[PDB]
Amino acid sequence: MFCFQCQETAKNTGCTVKGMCGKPEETANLQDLLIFVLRGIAIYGEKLKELGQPDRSNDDFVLQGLFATITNANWDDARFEAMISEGLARRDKLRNAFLAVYKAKNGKDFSEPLPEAATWTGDSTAFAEKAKSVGILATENEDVRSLRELLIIGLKGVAAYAEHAAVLGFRKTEIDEFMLEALASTTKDLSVDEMVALVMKAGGMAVTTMALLDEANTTTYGNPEITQVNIGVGKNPGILISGHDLKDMAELLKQTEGTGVDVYTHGEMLPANYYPAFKKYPHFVGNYGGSWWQQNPEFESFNGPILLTTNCLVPLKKENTYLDRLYTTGVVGYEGAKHIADRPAGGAKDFSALIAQAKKCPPPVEIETGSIVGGFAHHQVLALADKVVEAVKSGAIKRFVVMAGCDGRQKSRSYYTEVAENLPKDTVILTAGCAKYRYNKLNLGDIGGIPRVLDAGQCNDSYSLAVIALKLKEVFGLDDINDLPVSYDIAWYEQKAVAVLLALLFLGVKGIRLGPTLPAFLSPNVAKVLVENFNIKPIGTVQDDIAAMMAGK
Numbered sequence: 384m385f386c387f388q389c390q391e392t393a394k395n396t397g398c399t400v401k402g403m404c405g406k407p408e409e410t411a412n413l414q415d416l417l418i419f420v421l422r423g424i425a426i427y428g429e430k431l432k433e434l435g436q437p438d439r440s441n442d443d444f445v446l447q448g449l450f451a452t453i454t455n456a457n458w459d460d461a462r463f464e465a466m467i468s469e470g471l472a473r474r475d476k477l478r479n480a481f482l483a484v485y486k487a488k489n490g491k492d493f494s495e496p497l498p499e500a501a502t503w504t505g506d507s508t509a510f511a512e513k514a515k516s517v518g519i520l521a522t523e524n525e526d527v528r529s530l531r532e533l534l535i536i537g538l539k540g541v542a543a544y545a546e547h548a549a550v551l552g553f554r555k556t557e558i559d560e561f562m563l564e565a566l567a568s569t570t571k572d573l574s575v576d577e578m579v580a581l582v583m584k585a586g587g588m589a590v591t592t593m594a595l596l597d598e599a600n601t602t603t604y605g606n607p608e609i610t611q612v613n614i615g616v617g618k619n620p621g622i623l624i625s626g627h628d629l630k631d632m633a634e635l636l637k638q639t640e641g642t643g644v645d646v647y648t649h650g651e652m653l654p655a656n657y658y659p660a661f662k663k664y665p666h667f668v669g670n671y672g673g674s675w676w677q678q679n680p681e682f683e684s685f686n687g688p689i690l691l692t693t694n695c696l697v698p699l700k701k702e703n704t705y706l707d708r709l710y711t712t713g714v715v716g717y718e719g720a721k722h723i724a725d726r727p728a729g730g731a732k733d734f735s736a737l738i739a740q741a742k743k744c745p746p747p748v749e750i751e752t753g754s755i756v757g758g759f760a761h762h763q764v765l766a767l768a769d770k771v772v773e774a775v776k777s778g779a780i781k782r783f784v785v786m787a788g789c790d791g792r793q794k795s796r797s798y799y800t801e802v803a804e805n806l807p808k809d810t811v812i813l814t815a816g817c818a819k820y821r822y823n824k825l826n827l828g829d830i831g832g833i834p835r836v837l838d839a840g841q842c843n844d845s846y847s848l849a850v851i852a853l854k855l856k857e858v859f860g861l862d863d864i865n866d867l868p869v870s871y872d873i874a875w876y877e878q879k880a881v882a883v884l885l886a887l888l889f890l891g892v893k894g895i896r897l898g899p900t901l902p903a904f905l906s907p908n909v910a911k912v913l914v915e916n917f918n919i920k921p922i923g924t925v926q927d928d929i930a931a932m933m934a935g936k
């Protein structure tokens with residue numbers, strides 16, 4: 384196999400036998416074969432749009448297909464086989480439509496040679512063998528490979544955010560069109576300038592999509608607000624919801640109301656505690672456990688059903704006993720785990736089996752006590768603008784350090800905890816995404832009522848951090864956003880974090896420190912241009928980085 388899309392890739396070069404995340408060869412190869420079929424759909428879909436007869440009937444299929452190949456999202460080979468079969472039928476429908484339109488507009492049959500992604504077909508028995516030759520290493524030129532895979536990696540992060548927006552009824556034609564433009568581009572031989580322009584266009588589409596999901600979440604469930612979140616436990620059985628989907632949360636809360644089953648969040652569902660629509664339920668206890676990578680022991684000790692709305696779902700350890708109470712939904716899949724089917728249009732998912740099972744389980748084991756404060760998304764921070772600006776003017780807040788992003792299991796990530804603990808006491812950390820678990824359970828206190836850690840939400844809520852920076856740029860009359868007293872020390876893990884990075888680069892942010900390692904999908908030549916154009920830097924020592932950031936460098 385060959386996969387290098389996440390920060391934990393083997394030796395920081397690529398996983399070739401079994402992923403470091405646990406992804407076996409057969410699963411990795413099936414994901415490559417699905418991406419190949421998605422490229423075939425994109426070739427014809429792009430041509431139909433160019434002929435003036437666009438077909439958007441595969442929009443949700445493409446977002447879901449891409450999302451299913453994100454790190455820790457779907458482990459069920461049967462799901463990938465079904466998606467590949469369905470994708471082939473969808474592609475052939477587009478091909479037949481294209482051939483007739485082409486003939487009508489040109490007066491002759493289409494006859495130009497097409498990449499194999501547009502024409503290969505087979506039943507499920509042929510998938511495993513075909514998958515071996517259509518993976519990442521099929522691109523021999525290392526720079527072309529780097530730019531194509533960087534585009535697909537950023538694109539799948541954008542696809543995940545666009546899928547959550549779509550779930551809530553929010554869509555923009557430019558996003559779905561770009562999915563096919565970007566996928567089809569990877570079957571073409573393009574210049575370096577054209578390839579880099581597509582990556583920058585993906586960053587601009589990450590801005591669009593992150594703004595759209597921000598709109599969808601806040602319009603539907605209200606603007607996040609300051610909230611104290613309990614991290615201890617109650618005395619009833621509960622259901623633990625993890626991942627990122629807030630519509631699944633809305634439905635789970637409604638269905639569990641009055642049942643005697645409590646609701647707890649986990650991981651990237653922590654921000655559901657900040658939304659006014661969800662704070663109205665007394666049976667919503669709080670947040671359980673820590674980061675996604677600690678879930679084996681934490682899902683075990685939770686004792687009740689666990690619902691994964693999105694990644695990250697980690698394979699069970701041999702000794703784990705919670706498979707019978709593990710539930711997947713949306714694009715998540717796991718062999719042996721019960722899956723909750725998609726809601727009908729205008730309807731709701733059915734979580735009745737989780738509630739019935741939860742009533743038979745003991746209450747969660749208390750693993751810690753106390754609280755976490757958060758809810759500093761853009762509306763909430765802009766409502767406190769006068770207070771924040773006065774604190775900056777007085778010198779009470781010397782600098783903001785953006786430490787948003789996605790966490791992981793490598794030991795080198797203690798760097799983020801150590802940066803948080805050693806930053807001067809007149810600095811404020813801005814966060815979003817599971818990177819927050821490296822420093823959100825400390826006692827950093829506050830500066831005149833403003834907490835030293837301001838959690839805006841999920842990784843997608845890095846959007847709020849950009850909105851805040853743009854507001855401060857205007858307030859302080861600065862010509863360049865980089866001249867604010869703000870440093871960027873971002874942790875990344877999977878493809879949504881890469882989409883956030885591309886959005887920040889499109890927004891003109893320079894000098895970002897990215898860690899704890901730099902992506903394996905950046906070839907030496909591609910890495911050099913990113914350094915040249917954007918001044919992206921690796922992390923250094925805690926002492927060196929703190930000193931440099933405090934000097935604005």
Ligand code: SF4
Pocket residue numbers: 386387388389390391392393397398401402403404405406411454455
């Ligand atoms: S998702 Fe990450 S750890 Fe898993 S196979 Fe790919 S690069 Fe390796």
